[PDB]
């Protein structure tokens, strides 16, 4: 019950839906730091029937689709399929997208994502981008830009 756990956590009054207040205060009470336009981007993406409310199916679907996207990004970065992402792979991937960066810049990115202080694996990746509403590698790169300060 991934998304059941999350939803049950967020739905404070237990009326079966999560409103924007519950999402905000919820994310803060779970310790996930998000800006209002990120949270609102999540909400607008999730509210398929546009009633200003997230029911369980909408929530579950958003997180499912998002997880698929992030998994796709991960597997697109992992060139040698070792289930991990090395800095050189970030360099190559960004190079195919017309960005030339150095090894220490990629290392900087990875360290911004890693906690083990090694390179990042699928668990850290997934956890890091779980509530980050980036939709693809481009948006991930833009996020890396305002996160690390490097202009990429
Ligand atoms: Ca509610
Ligand atoms: Ca809705
Ligand atoms: Ca790899
Ligand atoms: Ca690591």
Author numbering: 22 to 139, 141 to 174
Task: Provide text from the study.
The mitochondrial ATP-Mg/Pi carrier (APC) is a member of the mitochondrial carrier family of transport proteins. APC is involved in the import of cytosolic adenine nucleotides into the mitochondrion and the export of inorganic phosphate from the mitochondrial matrix. Therefore, APC has the important role of altering the mitochondrial adenine nucleotide pool in order to adapt to changing cellular energetic demands. The N-terminal domain of APC forms a calcium-sensitive regulatory domain.
The consequence of calcium binding to the regulatory domain of APC is a stimulation of the substrate transport activity of the carrier. A structure of the regulatory domain of human APC isoform-1 has recently been solved, confirming the presence of four EF-hands, each of which is occupied by a bound calcium ion in a canonical pentagonal bi-pyramidal fashion. The EF-hands group together into two pairs, forming two lobes connected by a long central α-helix, in a similar fashion to the four EF-hands of calmodulin. The linker region between the N-terminal regulatory domain and the C-terminal carrier domain contains an amphipathic α-helix of unknown function. In the structure this α-helix is bound to EF-hand pair 3 and 4, analogous to the binding of a calmodulin recognition sequence motif to the hydrophobic pockets in the EF-hands of calmodulin. The protein construct used in the previous study of the HsAPC-1 regulatory domain was mutated at the extreme N-terminus to replace a cysteine residue at position 15 with a serine, raising the possibility that a native dimer could have been disrupted. Therefore, the mechanism that couples calcium binding in the regulatory domain to substrate transport in the carrier domain has not been resolved. Here, an independent structural determination of the native human APC-1 regulatory domain was completed, which was combined with an investigation into the oligomeric state of the full-length human APC-1 protein. Furthermore, an extensive comparison of the conformations of EF-hand proteins in the calcium-free, calcium-bound and peptide-bound state was undertaken, which has allowed us to propose a mechanism for the regulation of APC that is consistent with all available experimental data.
